[PDB]
């Protein structure tokens, strides 16, 4: 099945289907705890702890209930609750939070917000990229209340440039083009792409993707789309055939 309770209970195992582990850094801030629950199991995570994605299904969004807490003088205080989403590929994975409740400035109040957490995996080294050819990636774009978006992305490894498109999100303004952008090395010389998104040729935000896998099998990242109701965040993950 979805292996949600397995993920909350079992040690990492490299013989499980990759990606087998994701380090929770953005997803759990220092001074805070993240409690995930699903299928009758629960686990509490701190900053830097591993999430066992090896037990989860590939190419799908896995969903947990979450509580964000802080420990104050021996007592656990709930700051936020909602759904924690995990999208798993073979060399990459990402997390996201759909907030449903926050503290009532000792009570909770309803509040909805969607953000991307961690994007990680087996980063492709910029210095070990294919020297040429053109790779096509297909996968998913997901945002608040919508995991049905389709991402297409193409990389030209000679030009070291990529571009793509998001389609089929229920909110039409989110189905943006991912404009041509250069592959660059980041601080650790990981291969990364950052560029603008476009809607009807108009600039409408940005996107960034990492390249993952020894043979650049995968891309994963996120986009920010500017709207009159705020920035909307979209998780991005795609893979070659």
């Amino acid at each position, epitope marked *: 099945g979805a292996g949600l309770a397995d993920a909350l*209970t079992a040690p990492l195992d490299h013989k499980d289907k990759g990606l087998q582990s994701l380090t929770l850094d953005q997803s759990v801030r220092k001074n805070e705890k993240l409690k995930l629950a699903a299928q009758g199991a629960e686990k509490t995570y701190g900053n830097g702890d591993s999430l066992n994605t090896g037990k989860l299904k590939n190419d799908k969004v896995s969903r947990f209930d979450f509580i964000r807490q802080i420990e104050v003088d021996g007592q656990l205080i709930t700051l936020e609750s909602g759904e924690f989403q995990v999208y798993k590929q073979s060399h990459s994975a990402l997390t996201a939070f759909q907030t449903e409740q926050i503290q009532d400035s000792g009570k909770m109040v309803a509040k909805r917000q969607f953000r991307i957490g961690d994007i990680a995996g087996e980063h492709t080294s910029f210095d070990k990229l294919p020297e040429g050819g053109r790779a096509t990636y297909r996968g998913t774009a997901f945002g608040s209340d919508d995991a049905g978006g389709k991402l297409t992305y193409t990389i030209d490894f000679a030009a070291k440039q990529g571009n793509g498109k998001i389609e089929h999100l229920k909110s039409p303004e989110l189905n943006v083009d991912l404009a041509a952008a250069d592959i660059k090395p980041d601080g650790k010389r990981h291969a990364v792409i950052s560029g603008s998104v476009l809607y009807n040729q108009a600039e409408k935000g940005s996107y960034s993707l990492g390249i993952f896998g020894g043979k650049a099998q995968e891309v994963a990242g996120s986009a920010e789309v500017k709207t009159v109701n705020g920035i909307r965040h979209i998780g991005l993950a795609a893979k070659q055939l």
Partner: antibody
Amino acid sequence: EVQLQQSGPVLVKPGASVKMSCKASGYTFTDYYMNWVKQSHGKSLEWIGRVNPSNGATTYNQKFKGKATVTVDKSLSTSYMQLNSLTSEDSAVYFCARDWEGPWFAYWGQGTLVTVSS
Amino acid sequence: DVVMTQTPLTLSVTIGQPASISCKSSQTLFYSKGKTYLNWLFQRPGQSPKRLIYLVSKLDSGVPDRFSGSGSGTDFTLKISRVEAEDLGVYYCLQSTHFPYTFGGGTKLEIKR
């Protein structure tokens, strides 16, 4: 910083038993398998067994069946290995080592030197 | 059990020269596509082993790039492009595809000077 801190050297008598410990710090103990390994003086390494710290399930090298028992105490983030019916062939250094199959760092304890003598 | 036949037993090498160690298994260490569990370890006298290479060819953090691993199936090789003085010690291969896990007998690298 991760450490695997093993218990100190010990002398034990032939025919008796010995129990040694590996205390893990700096990571969630239940997230990784733990291995135990034997090294007789001047010899190669020998794998004894592996434990799942989250539930205590174990796998053993059949050469150590009835000799070695591996356990854990989650609340103390510690693994233990007990050797029974000791002989001079059990005199060796024993190591605990975290899961070494994957990209996650393969930590080793500092070893415990066991001497079997009367 | 899977027998790991590691050769040479001793390698005597001058600083700056290359070095190669071979490990042959009695049955293939292929686990599944892209996963072959062959590690190379290194141990200084009186100290604990450390891992240098995992999954045949992946270098651990904190290991110089002079070290490389290759091979497939039953035949694996650790290479040191140019030996430095601190490379002396004992190197072991280790398979984790099959239980029981098993180790080569070790290669002791000694420095000629």
